Paper text:
Microbial epoxide hydrolases, cis-epoxysuccinate hydrolases (CESHs), have been utilized for commercial production of enantiomerically pure L(+)- and D(−)-tartaric acids for decades. All these three CESH[L]s exhibit high sequence identity (>60%) with L-2-haloacid dehalogenases, which are members of the haloacid dehalogenase (HAD)-like superfamily.
To elucidate the mechanism of inactivation caused by D193 mutation, we determined the crystal structure of RhCESH[L]-D193A and RhCESH[L]-D193N. Comparison of these structures with the wild-type RhCESH[L] structure shows that these mutations did not lead to significant changes in the overall structure (with an r.m.sd less than 0.24 Å). This explains why the mutation of D193 caused the loss of enzyme catalytic activity.
Author numbering:
A (entry chain B), B (entry chain A): 11 to 247
Amino acid sequence: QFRALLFDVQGTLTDFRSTLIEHGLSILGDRVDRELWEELVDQWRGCYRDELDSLVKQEKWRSVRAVYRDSLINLLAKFSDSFCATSAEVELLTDGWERLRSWPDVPSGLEQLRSKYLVAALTNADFSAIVNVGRSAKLQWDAVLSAQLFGAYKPHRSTYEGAATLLGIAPSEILMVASHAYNLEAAREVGAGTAYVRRPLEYGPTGRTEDVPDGRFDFLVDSISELADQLGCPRLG
Amino acid sequence: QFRALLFDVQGTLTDFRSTLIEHGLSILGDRVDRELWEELVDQWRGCYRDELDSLVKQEKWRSVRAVYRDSLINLLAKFSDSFCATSAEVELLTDGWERLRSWPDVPSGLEQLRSKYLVAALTNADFSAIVNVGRSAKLQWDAVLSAQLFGAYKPHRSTYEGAATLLGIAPSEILMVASHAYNLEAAREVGAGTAYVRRPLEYGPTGRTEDVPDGRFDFLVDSISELADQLGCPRLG
């Protein structure tokens, strides 16, 4: 039925919240407390989502590293009574988005899927970032696709459709994998299969997550391994 | 010095001659003898090189699968006294270029390089083909680049430069690896490093290959592993 699985990366396969929290504390040290840096990370991710949504509505693209970098400079000004950062440290902190750590089910899950399927990443992150993230998150791909190649961000149909022609595959023979329900419904409209992955800690324990019911998508799983088990991929020794 | 290694695929990492010879014989069987089909393969590659060379001067791109297919149809017209093939068999024969086998030094050599460098494919083949070849040639990349993404073939400078911006890398921080000396010289022009890999059996045992002397390129090796050793990459267990 399926020849390839297209994967969302940030959140679906990677714990960016814990990554960026421990990334900033390691750089900033005691100049900022943990409780306050966790709140900057949350607002950081929120500024990225608000900006991309705005750029999608404008049908515009720009570097996601510039999106992270600019939105951190704006938050640092808002948090400037509590702590401070140099221009060099601003770049090092932004680099944390290219050092994402994967969820413990992802590397072995990806390995299990390759026995019958091609696996490729389709992220809004810049091409350089997802290549880097592959090292820090131990993601192993047949192909790496970014919103940078298509000039537009998900859920724009040019991204999903473009990924299909580049891979030589029909959308109906691609399984889109994401922990974000809105952009999974957009894969459905272009004709792709849909697999939702529950990530209760994507936005932390205090985060409200999307309640998705059984039957809305083709698959509903808590781990890539489970998805591989449901697709008929044999487990690893 | 180098942050990424960009690799030629067809010939540099893959024994396409042996792949396509045994591929067509399995499809055409006794309808064609080996010595006569081996001569078609050689002309096939040459029609591909002539067409791409023509398209580079025109600053045109078109699907390399269509290039292989069309140049196969022309050879079949040339060989129409000796044997014949259906349109279905034409597609299966063309599929042999997406089922290439690697030289035995390539998979472990690429893996050895990944300890210190990013490795990416930069082939004139269409994006779908190199994805397939990754399975048949056992190639594992941080990134996969094709002339299809840039609208131009190697050795056009838009390809090398585009691969640099996509990876976040300066051309001077890219090491181009190829078994074809002419297109290696253009990487040098854009500012990239140059590594030549001798493939004496690329065009068969009785085939004439590019004889490259010491000093023309930055590296001159008989295997990907050898290149990794010269780049300071620790060996594999």
